[PDB]
């Protein structure tokens, strides 16, 4: 119930629109790391993919999550940018 | 001339093989006089030989040598001012130790090396001497004697300059002292080197806090008297002028938090310069950045001085750096507790951006638990990463159980046995478990309690209680007093914020009373319940079934569980009877405890403690007398016997049941009783108020490593219990038990020890304000709580 | 206490007491040997006996100290495999608790540092001295210790599943896949990882985890 106190639960990478706007296709992997910092999650199963999840769960308000997915090629060059701002 | 073969004499344990390895010459070698001289010189140089001499034949040479004795043991005597371990370490570091040999001349150097130790410690007149005793085997036992001399004392601390402040005011803050007040039992004038540096820095800080930005200490001199009993310390200074801070400019990489830092660096016009204030500003900027995840910012403040205007311009350069992330949270030292019992307390998450305040909150929540003696936290940068850290909490576990066992007085009522175990962290699972029992010729008692504080992940608590009580005055049904009771409680608790929680629960109680002695208060209650027993006899019985709704609230912000030094705790508990119960009443009780540290190290602490209780019947009924409050004892007022404070029973003249002479009876008509008789038997009341003031001090003789296990205190206790329904008009000739103003007071000393069996409490108190019928108990001992 | 006799007979009595099984008097003799007669002919055997007797009293910190001293002072010695095995034994004994064992408590979620040190020592022993007589027992103990460490990781993952920290759950199970891929707890962790992916709506990753579960389950 709403009477039970709950602390805030934060998960993932801290994302700001200014930081996300600096990513371009063709950027090097280290350049992306410089722009955003290290991603806390990545594909373990054989693809060069980075996941930036910006998830905030307030005590009783609904959760919000932004997901930015970056796919690099075999050489480490960014090839696809996927941004889901909500849900 | 040739060395036909190696020959040696007089040696027993020195190997001839190593000797052959060592000297310039060995078996079969052609040798000459110069080589012989070199060989004997080398044999002398071996160190482990005392002296060497040689026999030369026409064709070959032979040598004989004496072994140097090895040290069998090292012993010390005297050295009252300093115990033996570091002396042993210094002596061994000087090149002499057990299992190795020494020359007689080495004592001349060992004595100087040892006297230098006392010279450094502060005893310049000390002297040392040593003696060696031979063993039956070729070994020496070393006896060493210290004649430690008079310790030197500080004669004067003089400051040259210091036109702005007097010397006494300046040196009042120093740790060194040249004069001691009459009333000091501790503290001494004895000089110490590294303490002087701290006092010099204290002088620096004193002047820097008053705006003397260009203060410097020119030089300091320490000198001895010719007899080496006195010490003189002189400090030369140039204080200069005092400057007022013109303004603060902040620049660099603010990471978007410029406004907050500008608020942190705000100043009023014309304020004097102050070093500690700018240091606080820097630390506050670091703290502010730390909340947003900037763990390693660069903060540097550079003051710029105007010579003519005598004002300070302050430049602060800030670089926030990167925002850091928590990769792992680790726990070390939890050999008994589950990982989850500690992880549930965390406010910082794994796999999220760092918040330093969240880490601090987790540390504080761990300290508040009481399961650990110490808690430390370390933020370790992940090697090879620019922006990731691991957070490690290091704990030491402590005994959370208590074993309360005791034996009652062997009076005519027979031996009484009491036992019980209370455990807060059962098997490291976080469950609270308690078992209590008591066996007496009259009474058999049992109680069981189990609580799980984390019935849900959010900290909802669930727990229950069972108890059984049975008092029989005699082993027969021949109209003797009996009191049987049992019941159940179940409670649900949940938090409402970081520091506050609420409770709700249900309870059942059975009570069965038989053959009560007629007395005023019990029988006023019995009339309130609609019973009309006869006051002239003990043939009576009363039975009730009760259901209550339980409610509670607790505030807790203590700095740690077992020996608090800061914060306070407030607990509220209450009951109300559910419709359908036999009794109809409410009852509420309030507990508070507040700790105020009067010391930077929290060694001197003032504790304020209070207790309150009030209950009353709801309909025409009254509150049952078995729910009454009691006062007196180690829990409430230490100078008084347990439950003695408060109203006393008034008995009616009645025929005693199971009567036999050679027994004491109250208002027994068999003994000729004819009127109401006043007694000392405490009966409790429906209103209660207790307050205590305590002063917590360091323990005089316990060492630092054991200081956390002992607490000593001086206390002032006061309390009172009274009956709000006592009708003083009907009973004018007896004490007015409705008056709340009969305050008992006591004072004494208490000592708390965290023993292997749990906390032990010893106290001695003098109850210097008493009332009629109060029973004193000056010495008290208790287990648990 | 110990007489002033030469090392020979005091060492003989130390052997006698050690055979008798009174470890404490054996320690009193052997420590007298060590203190009074350093670098004697008996010093190596004295240190080995000291390690053994300390281990039998369960004077575990002293056993650690003696073992470390022996390794440091004797970098190579024909009996060093024994000392490595004793190091592993002492570390793996520090990981136990008598009272909890009596009640049947599963201790795998308590502090795993001692078990990790024991794993390090036994692994070093087995890959350093494969033909020694202690290697089979050390291998069995290594299997047990790997299971225990994987279980600790699984318990942390389960807690964060209950808290709702999905990134932490994903990363913990990934670490389990990297470090303990062949343990049972790693098999138990896969559904947690798939659930954590689905909670963040990372469907493409959850499908991969589901494929792993389907391929390995039977």
């Amino acid at each position: 119930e709403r009477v039970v106190y709950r602390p805030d639960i934060n998960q993932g990478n801290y994302l700001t629109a200014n930081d996300v706007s600096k990513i371009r296709v063709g950027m090097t992997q280290q350049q992306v790391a410089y722009a955003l910092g290290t991603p806390l999650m990545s594909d373990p199963f054989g693809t060069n993919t980075w996941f930036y999840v910006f998830r905030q769960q307030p005590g009783h308000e609904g959760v919000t999550q932004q997901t930015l997915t970056l796919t690099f090629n075999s050489s480490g060059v960014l090839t696809n940018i996927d941004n889901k701002p909500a849900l | 001339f040739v060395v036909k073969d190696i020959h040696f004499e007089g040696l027993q344990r020195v190997a001839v093989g190593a000797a052959l390895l060592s000297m310039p010459v060995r078996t079969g070698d052609t040798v000459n006089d110069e080589d012989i001289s070199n060989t004997i010189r080398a044999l002398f140089a071996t160190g482990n030989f005392e002296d060497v001499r040689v026999l030369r034949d026409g064709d070959t040479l032979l040598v004989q040598v004496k072994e140097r004795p090895t040290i069998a043991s090292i012993t010390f005597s005297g050295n009252k001012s300093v115990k033996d371990d570091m002396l042993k370490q210094n002596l061994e570091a000087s090149g002499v130790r057990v299992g190795e040999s020494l020359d007689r001349t080495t004592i001349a150097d060992i004595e100087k090396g040892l006297e230098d130790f006392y010279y450094s410690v502060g005893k310049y007149s000390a002297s040392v001497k040593a003696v060696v005793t031979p063993l039956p085997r070729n070994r020496v036992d070393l006896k060493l004697v210290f004649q430690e001399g008079v310790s030197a004392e500080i004669q004067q601390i003089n400051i040259v300059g210091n036109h702005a402040f007097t010397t006494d005011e300046l040196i009042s803050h120093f740790q060194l002292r040249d004069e001691v007040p009459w009333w000091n039992v501790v503290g001494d004038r004895k000089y110490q080197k590294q303490k002087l540096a701290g006092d010099l820095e204290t002088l620096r800080s004193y002047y820097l806090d008053r705006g003397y930005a260009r203060f410097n200490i020119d030089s300091t001199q320490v000198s001895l008297t010719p007899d080496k009993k006195g010490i003189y310390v002189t400090v030369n200074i140039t204080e200069g002028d005092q400057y007022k801070l013109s303004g603060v400019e902040v620049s660099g990489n603010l990471a978007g938090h410029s406004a907050e830092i500008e608020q942190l660096t705000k100043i009023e016009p014309g304020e004097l310069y102050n070093g500690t204030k700018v240091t606080k500003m820097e630390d506050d900027i670091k703290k502010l950045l730390g909340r947003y995840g900037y763990a390693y910012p660069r903060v540097q403040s550079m003051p710029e001085i105007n010579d003519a205007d005598k004002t300070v311009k302050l430049r602060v350069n800030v670089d926030a750096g990167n925002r850091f992330y928590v990769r792992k949270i680790r726990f070390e030292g939890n050999d008994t507790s589950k990982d989850a019992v500690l992880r549930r307390e965390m406010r910082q998450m794994e796999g999220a951006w760092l918040g330093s305040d969240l880490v601090d909150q987790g540390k504080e929540r761990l300290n508040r638990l009481g399961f650990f003696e110490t808690v430390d936290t370390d933020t370790q940068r992940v090697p090879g990463s620019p922006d990731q850290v691991d957070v490690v909490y290091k704990v030491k576990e402590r005994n959370t159980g208590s074993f309360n066992f005791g034996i009652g007085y062997g009076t005519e009522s027979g031996v009484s046995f009491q036992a019980g175990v209370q455990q807060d962290n059962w098997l490291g699972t976080g469950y609270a478990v308690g078992i209590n029992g008591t066996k007496n010729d009259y009474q058999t008692y049992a109680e069981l309690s189990v609580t799980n504080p984390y019935f849900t992940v959010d900290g909802v608590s669930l727990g229950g209680r069972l108890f059984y009580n049975d008092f029989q005055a005699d082993d027969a049904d021949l109209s003797d007093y009996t009191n049987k009771s049992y019941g159940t409680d179940v409670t649900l608790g949940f938090p409402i914020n970081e520091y506050n929680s609420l409770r709700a629960g249900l309870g059942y109680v059975h009570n069965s009373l038989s053959n009560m002695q007629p007395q005023v208060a019990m029988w006023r209650y019995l009339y309130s319940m609609g019973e009309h027993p006869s006051t002239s006899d003990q043939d009576n019985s009363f039975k009730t079934d009760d259901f209550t709704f339980n409610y509670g609230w607790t505030y807790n912000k203590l700095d740690r569980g077992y020996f608090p030094t800061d914060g306070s705790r407030v607990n509220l508990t209450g009951k109300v009877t559910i419709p359908g119960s036999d009794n109809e009443y409410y009852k509420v009780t309030l507990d508070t405890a507040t700790y105020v540290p009067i010391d930077d190290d929290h060694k001197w602490v003032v504790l304020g403690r209070t207790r309150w209780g009030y209950g009353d019947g709801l309909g025409g009924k009254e509150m049952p007398f078995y729910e009454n409050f009691y006062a007196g004892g180690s829990s409430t007022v230490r100078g008084f016997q347990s439950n003695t404070i408060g109203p006393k029973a008034v008995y009616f003249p009645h025929q005693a049941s199971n009567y036999d002479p050679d027994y004491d009876y109250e208002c027994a008509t068999q003994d000729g009783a004819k009127d109401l008789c006043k007694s000392d038997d405490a009966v409790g009341g429906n209103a209660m108020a207790v307050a205590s003031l305590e002063f917590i001090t360091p323990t005089p003789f316990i060492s630092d490593k054991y200081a956390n296990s002992v607490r000593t205190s001086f206390f002032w206790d006061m309390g009172t219990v009274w009956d709000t329904n006592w009708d003083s008009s009907q009973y004018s000739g007896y004490p007015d038990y409705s008056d709340p103003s009969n305050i008992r007071m006591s004072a004494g000393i208490a000592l708390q020890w965290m023993s292997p069996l749990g906390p032990l409490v010893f106290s001695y108190a003098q109850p210097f304000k008493k009332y009629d019928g109060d029973k004193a108990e000056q010495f008290q001992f208790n287990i648990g709580k | 206490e110990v007489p002033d006799n030469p090392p020979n007979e005091i060492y003989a009595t130390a052997q006698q007491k050690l055979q008798d099984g009174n470890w404490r008097q054996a320690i009193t003799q052997l420590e007298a040997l060590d203190n009074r007669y350093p670098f004697g002919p008996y010093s190596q055997q004295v240190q080995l006996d000291l390690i053994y007797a300390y281990y039998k009293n369960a004077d575990l910190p002293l056993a650690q100290a003696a073992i470390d001293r022996f390794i440091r002072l004797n970098p190579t010695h024909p009996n060093i495999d024994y000392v490595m095995y004793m190091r592993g034994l002492t570390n793996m004994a520090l990981d136990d608790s008598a009272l909890q064992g009596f009640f049947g408590v599963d201790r795998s979620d308590r502090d795993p540092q001692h078990a990790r040190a024991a794993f390090s020592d036994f692994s070093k022993l087995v890959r350093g001295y494969p033909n020694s007589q202690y290697t089979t027992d050390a291998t069995k103990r290594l299997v047990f210790l790997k299971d225990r460490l994987a279980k600790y990781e699984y318990s942390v993952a389960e807690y964060y599943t209950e808290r709702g920290a999905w990134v932490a759950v994903v990363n913990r199970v990934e670490g389990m896949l990297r470090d303990y891929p062949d343990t049972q707890a790693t098999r138990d962790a896969l559904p947690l990882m798939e659930n954590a992916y689905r909670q963040m709506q990372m469907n493409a990753q959850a499908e991969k985890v589901a494929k792993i579960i389907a391929a390995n389950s039977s």
Partner: protein
């Protein structure tokens, strides 16, 4: 080490106190140099508190009394020359007082605590400060003319060497075991010489006769130096902080262990030694009526024959004891006790 018992002496003459006068509260337990001065049949004495008096030399009656005092902490010997009385204090002030009425002639701040006895020569007043500075003050107005810097050890002995003057050069000892000679025109260094052996090695006031400088270090050596070069001529393994007397062809000294010795002027070979006063804290010796006189911390005065070294007389004077030096001049022997009383001994 225990303090030696008071020796049993059969007095060959009975010394008596001519007069006594109290001077405030004296120096007390503070180790200091303050001692009385005699000039023109007038005695000048002071105390640490700041009191200074003029006393008639043959009766002890007061002439004038003033206070320089917060205490002044007067710790520097009373010196009188040319109508001025000079006192230094631990607040780094040197006072010049008129001998006629005791009013302040001038007051000057110096570089440090003026522990040493002021020395007056060639129109200058020489001061040696605790922080290792030697300074010259004009005797008329009190202005500082020149300063000399001397190295200070980390740990030293309380007190400072007072310079001596010869042919325009001032010779002074140092806390680091050096004897320094400086030209008094501007304080230019002439030569410097170490007199310690291979630890505390503070130095005493030197004495010059026939072109030879005699100096004495605490644990170091008694040595004779050439006044021109400073080269060492001979040395002896003796040590003291007390002043020593050079008379005729003998040297009288009291070592750091309170042993009284006589030495030859050339070579420094020992003539005799007296050891009965061992570890009794003795004052510096003085010659009076052909005898050697020393006080002790218990308040006895001991009279020593200069030929063989045996005691000739013994008298109990004051209960507070004697720390600072006695004074003998113009046929009068003077000494001031710790409590501040000044005695005239006959």
């Amino acid at each position: 080490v225990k303090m030696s018992p008071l020796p049993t002496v059969e007095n060959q003459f009975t010394p008596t106190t001519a007069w006594s006068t109290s001077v405030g509260s004296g120096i007390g337990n503070f180790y200091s140099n303050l001692h009385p001065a005699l000039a023109d049949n007038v005695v000048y004495a002071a105390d640490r508190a700041g009191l200074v008096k003029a006393l008639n030399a043959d009766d002890g009656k007061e002439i004038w009394s003033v206070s320089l005092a917060e205490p002044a902490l007067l710790s520097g010997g009373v010196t009188v020359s040319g109508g001025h009385v000079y006192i230094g204090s631990e607040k780094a002030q040197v006072y010049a007082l008129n001998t006629s009425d005791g009013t302040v002639a001038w007051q000057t701040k110096v570089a440090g605590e003026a522990l040493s006895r002021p020395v007056v020569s060639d129109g200058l007043v020489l001061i040696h400060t605790s922080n290792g500075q030697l300074q010259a003050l004009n005797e008329a107005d009190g202005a500082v003319k020149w300063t000399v810097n001397l190295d200070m050890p980390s740990l030293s002995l309380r007190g400072e060497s007072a310079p001596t003057t010869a042919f325009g050069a001032a010779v002074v000892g140092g806390d680091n075991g050096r004897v320094s000679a400086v030209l008094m025109e501007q304080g230019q260094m002439i030569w410097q010489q170490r007199i310690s052996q291979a630890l505390s090695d503070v130095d005493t006031t030197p004495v010059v006769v026939n072109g030879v400088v005699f100096a004495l270090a605490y644990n170091g050596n008694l040595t004779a130096l050439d006044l021109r070069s400073g080269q060492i001529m001979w040395k002896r393994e003796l040590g003291s902080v007390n002043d020593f007397i050079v008379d005729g062809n003998r040297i009288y000294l009291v070592d750091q262990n309170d042993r009284v010795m006589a030495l030859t002027i050339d070579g420094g070979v020992t003539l005799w030694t007296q050891s009965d006063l061992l570890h009794r804290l003795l004052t510096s010796p003085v010659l009076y009526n052909g005898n050697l006189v020393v006080g002790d911390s218990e308040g006895y005065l001991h009279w020593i024959n200069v030929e063989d070294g045996r005691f000739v007389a013994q008298q109990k004077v004051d209960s507070s004891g004697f720390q600072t030096e006695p004074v003998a001049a113009d046929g009068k022997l003077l000494i001031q006790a710790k409590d501040g009383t000044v005695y005239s001994i006959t």
